[PDB]
Amino acid sequence: GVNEVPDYHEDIHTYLREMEVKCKPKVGYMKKQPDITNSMRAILVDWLVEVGEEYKLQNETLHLAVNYIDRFLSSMSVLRGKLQLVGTAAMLLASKFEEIYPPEVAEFVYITDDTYTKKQVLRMEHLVLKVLAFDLAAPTINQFLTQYFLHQQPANCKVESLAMFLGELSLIDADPYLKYLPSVIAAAAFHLALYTVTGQSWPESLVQKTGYTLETLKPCLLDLHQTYLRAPQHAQQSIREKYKNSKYHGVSLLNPPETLNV
Amino acid sequence: GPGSMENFQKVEKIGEGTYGVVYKARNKLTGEVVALKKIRLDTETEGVPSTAIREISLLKELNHPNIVKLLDVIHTENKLYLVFEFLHQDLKKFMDASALTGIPLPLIKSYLFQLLQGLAFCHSHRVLHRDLKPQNLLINTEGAIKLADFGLARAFGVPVRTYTHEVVTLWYRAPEILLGCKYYSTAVDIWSLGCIFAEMVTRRALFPGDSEIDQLFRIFRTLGTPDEVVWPGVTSMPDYKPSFPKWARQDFSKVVPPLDEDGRSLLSQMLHYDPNKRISAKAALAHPFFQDVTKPVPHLRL
Ligand SMILES: COc1cc(Br)ccc1CO
Ligand SMILES: COc1cc(Br)ccc1CO
Ligand SMILES: COc1cc(Br)ccc1CO
Ligand SMILES: COc1cc(Br)ccc1CO
Numbered sequence: 051g052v053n054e055v056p057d058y059h060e061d062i063h064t065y066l067r068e069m070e071v072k073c074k075p076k077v078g079y080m081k082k083q084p085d086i087t088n089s090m091r092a093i094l095v096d097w098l099v100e101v102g103e104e105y106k107l108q109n110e111t112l113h114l115a116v117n118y119i120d121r122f123l124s125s126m127s128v129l130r131g132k133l134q135l136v137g138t139a140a141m142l143l144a145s146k147f148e149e150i151y152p153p154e155v156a157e158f159v160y161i162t163d164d165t166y167t168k169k170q171v172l173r174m175e176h177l178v179l180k181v182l183a184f185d186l187a188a189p190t191i192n193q194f195l196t197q198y199f200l201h202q203q204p205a206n207c208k209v210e211s212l213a214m215f216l217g218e219l220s221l222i223d224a225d226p227y228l229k230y231l232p233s234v235i236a237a238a239a240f241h242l243a244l245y246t247v248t249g250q251s252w253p254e255s256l257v258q259k260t261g262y263t264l265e266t267l268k269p270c271l272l273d274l275h276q277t278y279l280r281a282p283q284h285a286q287q288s289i290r291e292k293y294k295n296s297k298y299h300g301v302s303l304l305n306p307p308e309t310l311n312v
Numbered sequence: 313g314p315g316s317m318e319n320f321q322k323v324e325k326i327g328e329g330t331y332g333v334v335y336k337a338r339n340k341l342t343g344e345v346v347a348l349k350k351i352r353l354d355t356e357t358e359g360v361p362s363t364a365i366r367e368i369s370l371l372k373e374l375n376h377p378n379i380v381k382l383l384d385v386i387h388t389e390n391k392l393y394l395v396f397e398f399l400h401q402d403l404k405k406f407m408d409a410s411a412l413t414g415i416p417l418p419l420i421k422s423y424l425f426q427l428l429q430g431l432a433f434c435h436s437h438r439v440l441h442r443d444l445k446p447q448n449l450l451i452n453t454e455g456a457i458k459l460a461d462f463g464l465a466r467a468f469g470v471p472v473r474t475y476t477h478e479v480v481t482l483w484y485r486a487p488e489i490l491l492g493c494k495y496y497s498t499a500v501d502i503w504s505l506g507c508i509f510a511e512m513v514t515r516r517a518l519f520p521g522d523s524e525i526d527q528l529f530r531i532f533r534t535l536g537t538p539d540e541v542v543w544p545g546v547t548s549m550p551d552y553k554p555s556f557p558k559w560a561r562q563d564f565s566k567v568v569p570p571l572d573e574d575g576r577s578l579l580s581q582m583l584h585y586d587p588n589k590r591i592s593a594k595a596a597l598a599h600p601f602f603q604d605v606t607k608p609v610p611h612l613r614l
């Protein structure tokens with residue numbers, strides 16, 4: 051019913067599709083980053099996952115913060131000793147945007163081990179808002195996934211949680227996932243989550259809604275399949291630890307499929 | 313942005329909010345009258361207020377003739393200035409200004425219809441206002457009304473998740489908020505517009521409650537007390553009480569007596585108990601009540 055905004059869902063989907071292109075980070079920003087690497091970004095994002103679990107923040111908030119960070123690093127050269135300041139300010143902004151009860155600024159200073167002062171956090175807060183021109187209503191993977199989830203016949207909470215989890219894994223690795231838009235990773239994550247649990251595939255209803263097919267999705271699916279297979283051995287492990295929880299139906303314990311019959 | 317305080321000449325104070333104060337100003341190079349909303353970040357030990365982060369981010373995307381235009385944000389370290397297009401009056405002050413005259417049906421109708429267009433556009437861009445009241449609706453001298461004060465607004469996902477419960481000024485608040493529902497959606501902004509439609513006709517608020525339960529009891533005495541028939545799930549709702557008095561539904565003709573058949577149809581669909589059956593802003597634009605809609609200028613000097 052109205053909670054699924056039947057009169058607005060298509061207008062909304064079309065709008066996010068436009069805005070995801072506007073909110074896209076530069077695929078090749080780390081090469082132009084002289085002091086930070088993909089490996090360092092993965093460390094930051096994995097930390098942000100842990101912080102979202104500690105303060106019991108929404109997944110949406112995590113996704114927003116990652117968007118803000120990548121867009122920021124697309125235009126602003128950052129020293130490695132300051133990467134956590136950018137990240138903390140991103141998570142504060144994301145929290146004030148998306149959370150009913152954002153943690154206090156003092157709580158954000160605290161999680162950085164007093165690496166930074168409250169004054170440093172509030173000043174980066176201002177800088178990020180200036181660099182992003184206050185454009186914070188960015189489409190996330192989640193906003194796509196929740197709409198896609200309405201095409202399940204029937205709804206399966208293991209499928210939902212596993213797609214959420216796979217989409218989160220993508221936030222960690224700027225290579226390759228910077229090259230895919232939120233709507234596309236969501237589609238890959240959903241199809242991969244559906245097959246692993248139900249054996250079913252990307253539905254036509256979603257081909258109709260998205261214009262995307264398994265052929266258009268093949269490049270991201272192959273990348274996500276590999277990420278899923280390789281996840282127990284990735285240096286970052288915080289998303290798997292998180293997705294062992296009952297909140298998420300222990301989906302991190304599900305075995306990835308060996309092949310995709312693509 | 314491409315703006316500086318030196319090009320604005322202040323004219324007078326026109327308003328005030330938790331943020332701070334609103335000023336009518338004039339652009340010294342262009343001639344353009346603006347409203348300048350000042351936010352104090354100095355009193356803010358928690359940085360930029362979340363209300364302002366939402367208002368700016370959301371108003372930046374919402375370019376629509378019946379939504380107030382954020383022209384700019386002047387962003388120093390001590391202060392944030394929001395540059396808005398200038399509109400002369402709020403709908404509350406004009407209804408009071410029409411106290412004895414009445415507001416003309418053609419203006420009531422053009423106002424509702426433009427409010428329904430701006431709402432439809434907010435809803436089509438995943439935005440809930442959550443504070444629609446006459447005080448937050450701005451009129452100009454040419455016949456436009458626009459939605460403003462987006463400090464309580466929220467960017468929503470589909471389907472919706474649980475958002476803040478402390479939402480909407482009491483007299484314009486929808487039952488599902490009053491009944492502690494886990495979820496609320498675009499239907500809450502329609503409830504508020506329906507209260508506003510009635511208020512434009514009567515120049516008095518439809519549900520003037522002094523408490524949440526008085527608000528609930530005043531709605532239930534006007535529209536009847538909702539059962540499982542009219543609103544499946546109501547008796548299961550968190551703040552629903554079995555002991556709630558069971559008032560009968562009066563003939564809707566008596567809720568707003570001067571309304572015609574078409575007006576009454578539309579008010580009824582905007583004030584349906586079930587958020588699922590309540591009319592969308594999109595659908596309401598096609599309502600027979602608007603077959604003869606025009607955009608007249610307001611009849612009083614502002
Ligand atoms: C201080 O160590 C770091 C640095 C960055 Br960037 C992100 C996370 C951590 C872990 O707390
Ligand atoms: C109009 O120009 C303004 C307006 C306000 Br409000 C506050 C300061 C200035 C500086 O000139
Ligand atoms: C934000 O408040 C506004 C905005 C404009 Br435009 C016109 C009047 C007011 C009253 O305060
Ligand atoms: C037909 O004229 C009407 C009708 C209604 Br309802 C409310 C106001 C007016 C004009 O003051």
Ligand SMILES: COc1cc(Br)ccc1CO
Nearest residue numbers: 597598599600602603605
């Ligand atoms: C001709 O215009 C109409 C007619 C009917 Br019926 C309903 C709504 C409108 C909108 O203006």
